[PDB]
Each structure stands twice: as structure tokens, then as C-alpha cells.
Amino acid sequence: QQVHLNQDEYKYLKQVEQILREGTRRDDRTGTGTISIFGMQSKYCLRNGTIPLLTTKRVYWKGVLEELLWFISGSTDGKLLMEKNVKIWEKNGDRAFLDNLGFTSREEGDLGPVYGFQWRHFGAKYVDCHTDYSGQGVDQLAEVIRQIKEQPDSRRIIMSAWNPSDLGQMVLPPCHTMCQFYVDNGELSCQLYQRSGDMGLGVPFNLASYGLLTHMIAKVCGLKPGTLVHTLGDAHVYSNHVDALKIQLDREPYAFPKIRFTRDVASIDDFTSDMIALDDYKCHPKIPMD
């Protein structure tokens, strides 16, 4: 029967199996095939410092970590993240990518009013990735933190990246579109709504990212981490990735690693990559992709 060291990662694999077994076979934005279920939900225990970094296929932790800190900082400048040696946004801000979208006047690495800007300045008039936006638009992350501290019973602790007014100027429309927080018996929980998820790369990354976010905010608020709830619109596997995911489905998950913060923080803006430690991230062997 179903006895597993890491039940939450096992359920993830079950999620992937269900997509491949019941999913619809459609052609997507690029003309490639996906196998897809619309509407899925899964839950991940964050208690005792557990962060859900998948063990059956390695997730780029360094990238997760630096992108999150960068999001939080409000930055929309791809070059700042490249300075931290993370290159996941590089191809979305280069001359060719920008020009193809009509952003011929824009400087390289200026990603437009993407996540960081929305999280910290929702409603402000975007100029460029070098403008000082202090006190412009709504600082959602700050409000979420005040709400958690002052009104922990609230059912309105929401942060959203989905800004229709700004979509035309973003290099990519937001994928993790919004999240909601929830305080129960001194524990902080988070639900991510992600409109679109690739189960082979994107989803594991987003999973770790919001897991880390919940850990950070919990610390800032003097709370213990709770449950991450991950909700998907179009959950899919690319049809060229099926063999690779099948190899992943065959593995018995290891225990998730643990997150550890090595100093105190004054606020959500007071973390640095050197004081966020990840203990015992053990992964199964590499899975080659195509």
C-alpha cells in the first residue's frame, strides 16, 4: 500500500501520472504538443523548516533563491539578477527579444512592469527599470505583512501580479498570477494560483519559490511556517518530455531539504542569499531533457 517517506512529493508524481493518463492532447502557443489538465490542486507541508524542492528531479535552487530576493526588491532589471549569476531571465530581456515585442527604444534587461514592480508598486506609472518608484502605487508585500501581523484572521491577505493595464509592456505575462496567505494557530499558510504550469521544469521551480516566500514572511511575522497550497490552471507536460517524466515517476522520493535562516532580519527587505541555508538537498540522478 501507499507508505511513503515523502508523501507530498509522491502526490506530485501522482499529479503528473494523472495528467499523462487523463489529459487532453492539444497544440500550444509555440505549435508544440502538450498533454494537459485544466484545474489541479496539491498541498505541501512546510512545518519544521521543510521546503518542497523536488528530490526525484533536481530544481535550480540558486535560481529560485536569487529570483525571489530580486522579486522582493521590486527590481525589473534583468542585469541585477545576472550579477548574481542567475541567467533564467537573460533571454527575455535581450535586444532581439525586446525588439520582437516592439520595445525598440528599451534598454537590454529592462523586463517591463513584471512581478517585482507589481508586488511593490501596483498601480504606479512604469517608466524604466532604473526609475525610483518610492511611494508610488500599492506596496502589496508590505500590506500583506501588516495584515498578517495585525489582522491574522483576515480572509483578504492577497498579493497579485496580474495587472491588465501593464500586460502589454511586460516581456512575459505573469505566470504565478496571485497568492493568498492564511494564519492558523500561529502557522502561516500560502495558496498560489498559477495560470499555467509545466510539470517538468516550471512547476517545481514555482513550488520551491513560494515555499521559500512563506518561510521568509513567517520569520518576519514571528510565525511558524504552515502549508503551501498550489493551484494550477493549465497543468501540462510537453509531449516531447514524456519519456523523461516516466523516468521521474519511477523514483521513490527522498525527504525534502530544510530551510534555515542564519541571522535575524529587520523586515522582508533584510534577507541576503548568504543567510538563507538549505540543508540536506539530496536528489536522484540527472534526467536529460529535449
Next chain:
Amino acid sequence: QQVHLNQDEYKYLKQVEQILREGTRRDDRTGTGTISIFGMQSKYCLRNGTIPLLTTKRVYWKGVLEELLWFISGSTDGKLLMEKNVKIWEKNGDRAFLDNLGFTSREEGDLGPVYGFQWRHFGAKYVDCHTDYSGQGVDQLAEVIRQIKEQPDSRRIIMSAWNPSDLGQMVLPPCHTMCQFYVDNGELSCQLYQRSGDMGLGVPFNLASYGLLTHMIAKVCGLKPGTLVHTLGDAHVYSNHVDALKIQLDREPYAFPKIRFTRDVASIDDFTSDMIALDDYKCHPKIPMD
């Protein structure tokens, strides 16, 4: 048994039951006790005209229908609904309610930049509930319809009411915060993200509302209805509703009613209450409590 005429309503009852059994006890913003689960999801088939109006406890159909048409019209004037003998917004737009929020210059019924305003003019400058907003802000509903018709493969078909810039001026923050649409083999599906849901009174109403909207857009787009995915943040039952819900839980659901449109429509703005028929809405008798 394990077999039901209406498996979808049966699953909703099981949802209520899961909350009562596994939910956490909380005292909310109102003061009354809730029993709560954070993060739930359920699916409702809409194929062949089916609309999930609950049968074990009657849903206020006239309210659902008139509110939706009013939403689509972009109106934020509560008096238009009161003109049709729908009083669900009355408490929220009267003198004392407005004054308590500091909207002391507002006429009665001026709900602020609520749903309808966000749907048709996201990012526009709110003045009052009589202002003509043509060409101001993003018409999200029209874009959704454009995307469904022209890019049915899109994983980006989103409409959101969650506007941080406008929250302070709304009489209530949006409860059904955003929805995503999905086209598969000519079948239109919709996922609602609801941040907060009263299983007893709110949720059934929200289900019927988004069910109806999905049927409407499907007709506009020459498509067929698919599935409604209902996602909840704080899924709760009010502690004083417990006994009446226990009664409801032993009822065997009847078949859902079906929706039928009795003439063609030029666009999403061309529906009227008289041409939306609801066939065979058969319910169990009223509950001995409220």
C-alpha cells in the same frame, strides 16, 4: 452509495462534510465562529446545458442572474439591482454603510469600483456610479472573448477583479477575485479563484453565477460548455449553520437544472433576463433553519 444521479452536488456535500470533520475552528472578522479549511477545489460538469444550481438547498436564481447581467453591464449602481427587486447589495450601499466607511459624499447605491467596473474598465479613474467610462481602462471581458475566439490554445485567458489601487474605494473587497478560461475541442471551461467562501450561503450562489457566465461566453464564442473549476481560499461553514447543514448532508441530490437561451445574441452585452430559461430546477424542501 458510491453511485449518484448527481455526483457533482454529491461531491459538494462531501466538501462540506470534510470541513466539519477536518476543519479548524476560528473566530473571524464578523465575530461568529467559522470552521475552516484553507485550499479546496471541486469540479462541476456543464456539458449539455447543465448548470450547478444546488438541489439539496435552493439557490436564489433571480439574484444570480440579475447580478451577473448587472456585472457584465459594468454598472456599480446598487439601485439598478433594487429596481429589479434584488436586494443583495442594499445593506452595502445604504447611508449608514457608506458613511461608516467615510464615503459621506456618495449617493446611496454607489458601491465604488466593484466587480463590474474592474471587468470592463480595469485601471480607469473611478468617479461615481453614473459616470460614462467608455474607452477608459481595460475591457477584460471583451479581451477574454477575443482570446477565446482567436487564440483558443492560450493559457493566458484571465479576468480579475482584484485591483489594489481601488480596494479602499470599494464597499467590499472582491470575493470571487479572478477567473481563467480554457478551450478544449470546442468546449469552454472556467476556473474561479474565490479567496473566501461560505459553503452554506455564498458558494452555491458563486457556483451558479460562474456556471451561467461560462454558458453565456460559450454561446457568444460559438462553443459548447465544458467544466467549472471552483477553487477556494478559506472554505468555511458558519458554526451556527452546522445543524441545518447536517440536515442538508443526508439529502440525495436531484439532477442539476439546465440552462437554455431562447434567441441569438449579438455579443456578451446582448443578453436580457427574459431570454435565459432555466429548465427543471427541482429542489428539496426548505430547511427548518435560516
